Design a binder for this molecule. Structure first.
Ligand SMILES: NCc1ccn2ccnc2c1
Length: 182
């Protein structure tokens, strides 16, 4: 509908896949080469389905901060025969608040879904499903099960992936440029 949705659509069309684990189907953001991200509660194993193709996992790392606190991001390297468009230049360097964000989702249950969520707060600490979690972004939109792994963008920035909600608010884990130095 406008330039925020234009940027969101460009990320979804080239830099997402449908990831299936034993815990469900998730939007999965490809960042560069064969490296993608997914919420840690997806419980990635040795094998994952990527667009319904059986795929070996070459590496999976559940990120924590230097306080040894959950960040709810898992970085996955996939045994896939094709590289992602490198979008690391769209990742913020520091923790921040944002105006006018879009949460975008693409699964078999939730195809071609775009949600204008408005203002995004640097929330920080969240007890997420009982797990102390840091670097949480918050938006005032009633997100639902199946939106996990959804991409949060503003024009020219990929800022987070959706990891939970409380019925009234939605919560995303930050993506930072420093997670993807190779
Ligand atoms: N219940 C499935 C679904 C899929 C895509 N959507 C886009 C907007 N609302 C929906 C709902």
């Amino acid at each position: 509908m406008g330039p925020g949705f234009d940027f969101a659509q460009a990320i979804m069309k080239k830099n997402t896949v449908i990831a299936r684990t034993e815990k469900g189907e998730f939007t999965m953001l490809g960042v560069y080469d064969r490296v993608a991200v997914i919420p840690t509660h997806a419980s990635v194993g040795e094998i994952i389905y990527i667009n319904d193709v059986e795929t070996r996992v070459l590496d999976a790392c559940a990120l924590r901060d230097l306080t040894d606190t959950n960040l709810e991001i898992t970085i996955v390297k996939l045994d896939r025969n094709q590289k992602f468009r490198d979008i690391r230049h769209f990742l913020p360097r520091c923790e921040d608040d944002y105006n006018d964000a879009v949460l975008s989702v693409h699964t078999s249950k939730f195809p071609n879904m775009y949600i204008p969520v408005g203002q995004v707060t640097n929330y920080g600490f969240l007890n997420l499903g009982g797990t102390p979690t840091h670097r949480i972004l918050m938006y005032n939109f009633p997100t639902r099960a199946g939106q996990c792994g959804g991409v949060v963008t503003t024009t020219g920035k990929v800022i987070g992936i959706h990891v939970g909600g409380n019925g009234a608010q939605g919560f995303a884990a930050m993506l930072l440029h420093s997670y993807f130095t190779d």
